[PDB]
Amino acid sequence: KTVVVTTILESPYVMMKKNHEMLEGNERYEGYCVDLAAEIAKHCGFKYKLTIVGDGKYGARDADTKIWNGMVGELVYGKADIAIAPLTITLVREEVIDFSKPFMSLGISIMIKKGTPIESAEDLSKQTEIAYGTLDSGSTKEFFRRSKIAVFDKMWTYMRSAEPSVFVRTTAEGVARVRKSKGKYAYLLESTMNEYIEQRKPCDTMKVGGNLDSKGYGIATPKGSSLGNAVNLAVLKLNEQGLLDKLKNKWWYDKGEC
Amino acid sequence: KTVVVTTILESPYVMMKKNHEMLEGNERYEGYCVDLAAEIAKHCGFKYKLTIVGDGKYGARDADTKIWNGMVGELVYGKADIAIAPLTITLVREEVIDFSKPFMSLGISIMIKKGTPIESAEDLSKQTEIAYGTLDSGSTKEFFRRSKIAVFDKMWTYMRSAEPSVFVRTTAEGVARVRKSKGKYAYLLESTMNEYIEQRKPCDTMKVGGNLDSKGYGIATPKGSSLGNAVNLAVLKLNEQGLLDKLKNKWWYDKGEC
Ligand SMILES: [Zn+2]
Ligand SMILES: [Zn+2]
Ligand SMILES: [Zn+2]
């Protein structure tokens, strides 16, 4: 039967085509993950339907109810068969769902509006004129919340209490905030996205400093899924075939407008 | 009871302590993987014995023999319970053994003697005065042998037929060859090793160009091993806590000699 793929609208991973209104099904979308999903479905020989996660989140566990939201939740509760998106491989998630070996390597990075007096995380933690935050319900927020290293811990103390809130619902919201904040806001996001945005108009942002950590994105399946094994080998095969690198250049720099 | 850990003598992952002759068991060794093995064992709750792979190889399957050698072979045939070393996660290997999520991210790179007129793989492929090769029985050689992209295919065509052999039995042998060839030999090895050597006296080598691919190292266990699950969670836990980054700084740069 048709495999239900959950994903999220996040450029350049998954975006609606210009003429999506006249298109149907999987044809309505384009992007790195759209291409990746097609490659995987072909090598594993299955039909699939791309669906956009209902709450538009990656996935976090509610501390009160212990209920998972986002794409992780759709997998945990049987609403989806596989997640193909820029979903970060983490311990808390690995405990409830399965991840293939990473199809992309990245790390948390700093996005500033061009000209802002910031070059590192240490620089952000020593000032208060410039606010900074992260995406909600994801791995980046968890990183700071659970960090015991001096600089990041102090950053979390500031962010978790900040008012107004420095957290955002979507990457787009964080990027917009940096751009319209005259440089009084810095956004903490994964290098993959930072590098992508840095190459798009109005070309007013830039990634500064080195990554804060090293991790990766994996294709996720529910625990005990029959697709788990196959997808994992498919990812490795595609990386060694050079496909993943091919797709990276196609959506990041071949389309770059800066 | 005691878990047999197979590893390889590869600096700075595993090395004999200066006074190993007067030490016993695991205390005889030191290095990144020795430090990592101790942590993995503590977190998974098991006692272990470090052993150096008999043939000093990482692992490849003999074409006609069909027998796996190196650390992979030790796991495949039941001589070791786990491998903790800079062992690359690859498709052919994941087909016979299990790998944890990566504990280190790296890629194939080029090592030259300082002053060598080479800036990239494309440069090596378009000339013939400078010879170049890779390590034997490993993922790097397999990368070129299977590559379908023009530049690497061209490089493989040359390397596979070059005489005398451009391949080496150990990383140390390749590094020595670069150092003694007066710029007439370039070595293809993983970025991790390239970066390490670049910081070792006589500081006469350097890493040039970007990485050729993107992959990682994983802790390997025999397929279906009962240690697999715990080890994987341990790796994720340790990466998130910053131990892996702390360990790389300790063995790579804190001890740099250049
Ligand atoms: Zn394909
Ligand atoms: Zn709640
Ligand atoms: Zn520990």
UniProtKB/Swiss-Prot annotation, chains A, B:
Listed name of the protein: Glutamate receptor 2
Organism: Rattus norvegicus
Subcellular location: Cell membrane; Postsynaptic cell membrane; Postsynaptic density membrane
Residues where L-glutamate binds: P86, T88, R93, S139, T140, E190
Highest rank taxon of the organism: Eukaryota
Induction notes from the record: Down-regulated in the pyramidal cell layer of CA1 in the hippocampus by global ischemia.
Tissue specificity note: Detected in forebrain. Detected in dendrites of neuronal cells. Expressed in the pyramidal cell layers of CA1 and CA3 and in the granule cell layer of the dentate gyrus.
Function: Ionotropic glutamate receptor that functions as a ligand-gated cation channel, gated by L-glutamate and glutamatergic agonists such as alpha-amino-3-hydroxy-5-methyl-4-isoxazolepropionic acid (AMPA), quisqualic acid, and kainic acid. L-glutamate acts as an excitatory neurotransmitter at many synapses in the central nervous system and plays an important role in fast excitatory synaptic transmission.
Record note on modification: Palmitoylated. Depalmitoylated upon L-glutamate stimulation. Ubiquitinated by RNF167, leading to its degradation.
Record's comment describing the protein's domains: The M4 transmembrane segment mediates tetramerization and is required for cell surface expression.
Lineage, opening ranks: Eukaryota, Metazoa, Chordata, Craniata, Vertebrata
